[PDB]
């Protein structure tokens, strides 16, 4: 789950935490959470639960006093987090002078939470037509921060306006077909992620047919089918297979321009129309050796046939005594992209996917292991109605499209965390910059694989990662960084529209909106996680190499000796490594 | 109006302007606008109209050469504005060394427009179901920046995608009830302000009694009734008086929360609902 929880702010150097008094701040008297409680509220404000008094900055005299103020007034109260500190009104830090907190704008002060390493700002703010609540709110002459339970309503109830005394518009504390609750699809997604659930994922036709006859449901709502990843066609909220679609025949379904990038479900007839879901609308969220060319991968073998024939002839030919290609993991896509003779950039490949019943419901020709769907962004190419369906590999990435399969083309068929060769481990928290491992990337498919793994792990925004790209010379050259001794040339670069804005530093990697790009930030102190891949007298020599050697055995010696520290003993005579030409 | 007009970038200290050659930049030979033409295009990019060869930065060696590149490639090309200068890839200024433009990231350089004190960057970028055009575009094996006329279409026609050769979806160069043209109300407003016009302002009932009977018009469209100023209730695009209103009885018309902050017209009965005007939907601008 992801919700706001009460906490306490403590100083790092001195064991003092914030304690409020009638109009000011007093000494610690800490380690007792019976009175000292703080929380984050809207407009980036800090709120005390018990005292019901918030802090602010009143810049009116020469020395701005840091006293208590009412949360409903023109006090201009808000606070933000710098790399290891707190800044308020205008670069004003909550400086401590052994008992009282003032604003002197000093760069030497740290603030953490209770008994744990955290910048107390990694968790963002969390929260009448199902509108989000407004925290805090003044009711019955007292301030309140949470949807409390009373004897008036059934359960928890909150306010949907900044001033409930003048508007008198309440709402239900939403912690499921919420009819007559028109919200944005992004707002619905962030609210349902606040509750820890995910959007509706339709896997079989039974659930859809059950939802058709439902009375207490809106005729128009969202399902969650959207492309958060700009390099793939269509996905769900979670990682569910794409085998059941209910697209619409009326609209031409423009891929990216002309149409939109969202789906809307019509239940009166069961269609999925392309549209923009930025407006308000109801929703709902719940070591085999193989024979002569066939490359083996975990028991089975794959091989591409060099014949160019139609879909039916390919379905009849090697189903040879063989079966068509079946993707069930991530390594098989690598096997397909690495082979196929430079992928034949301008060409297509076949793959067998069948569907006879209406609406479209894809099933595997041999098996039912539909786990990975890798479609082009964004050409689903789902026709109106057709009994023969077909799927084709396009592009160097190996994306899935739906051609007409009326021409002659080649195909591939088969015969009888971790990735397959290396592991990938991620930690819980990483405040410094790469103190244990440094991830290095060399190819694009590895970027796609790590992005898929991060999408399977990460589920929300406001997250960052680390990639081995930095520079310490502060000159302007960027290359693949390491722990020292890296001189390889950058072969691939996927930047944003205008990503590089600093002549140095360490880059980051976000998965919120522009997923899969190398975001750039400063490298002074930036908390972000990272994933890691897991003869005069007594002389013997020979001029056969134009060099006089001196080696020893492994038994007559005192201790085992090697060429490592030889520079400490032989360099006095101008000696070096074993020089063979 | 507000549109991207052809111009030339000049240097402040000495009288030098950019002149593109087969793969580089050479001395000024300026004061002649027969070949030296430059324009701003999407992704914050600079395009030369005659040579049809854009500039970029290829950081692959120790000293990244500033040469010409194909505008359809992975070159990482874009330029932005600093207070009195221009920075490209990463704090890389277009340094001038008396004849050629390079990238040394020097903080002593100034660029302006031809014969006018201007930062050449105060004017932002300007521009199939009436979607905005994509400039430039490669057609017939050559680059094009403006909606040019031909013998196929009636007038100007542009491309509505990044690669017209693979998608094949064009549109009319929209310089008026555009039916089947679903755009966002904000996008519609900025597009009709690019054209120099403003949104529809209903002043008398005669305009409404003329529009309700109109055949060639969508059943739903935008008029422009919105509050761009957060301290006042409802206004139009221009400064027109608020005397004629056509509000709705069905919806409770929530002021700010519960409803939204845009107006949505229904022409079947002439009604104004409260709604969110961020989605794609037809409109009209006078």
Author numbering:
A (entry chain D): 30 to 156, 164 to 211, 231 to 341, 358 to 390, 392 to 488, 508 to 625, 643 to 689
B (entry chain C): 30 to 156, 164 to 211, 231 to 341
Task: Reproduce passages from the article.
Building on this finding, we observed a large change in the elution profile of DEC-205 at pH 8.0, eluting with a mass four times that of the monomer, suggesting that in basic conditions DEC-205 formed a stable tetramer. We next performed cryo-EM analysis on the DEC-205 tetramer in basic conditions (pH 8.0). Here, the DEC-205 tetramer formed a 115 × 200 × 100 Å toroid shaped particle with a large central cavity and was ultimately resolved to 4.9 Å. The overall architecture of the DEC-205 tetramer revealed a major rearrangement of the second CTLD ring that enabled four protomers to assemble into a prolate toroid with clear D2 symmetry in the 2D class averages and final reconstruction. In contrast to the structural conservation of the first ring, the C-terminus underwent a dramatic rearrangement to form a tail–tail interaction along the median of the toroid. Within this extended confirmation, CTLD8 from one protomer contacted CTLD4 of the opposing protomer and vice versa. The cryo-EM reconstruction was unambiguous for the placement of the 10 (CysR to CTLD8) domains except for CTLD5. Here, the cryo-EM reconstruction suggests that CTLD5 is highly mobile within the tetramer, and the domain could act as an allosteric center for DEC-205’s pH-dependent rearrangements. As observed in the DEC-205 monomer, CTLD9 and 10 were absent from the final reconstruction, solidifying the notion that they are a highly dynamic part of the protein. Broadly the BSA of the protomer 1 and 2 head–head interaction accounted for ∼2300 Å2, whereas the protomer 1 and 3 tail—tail interaction was ∼1500 Å.
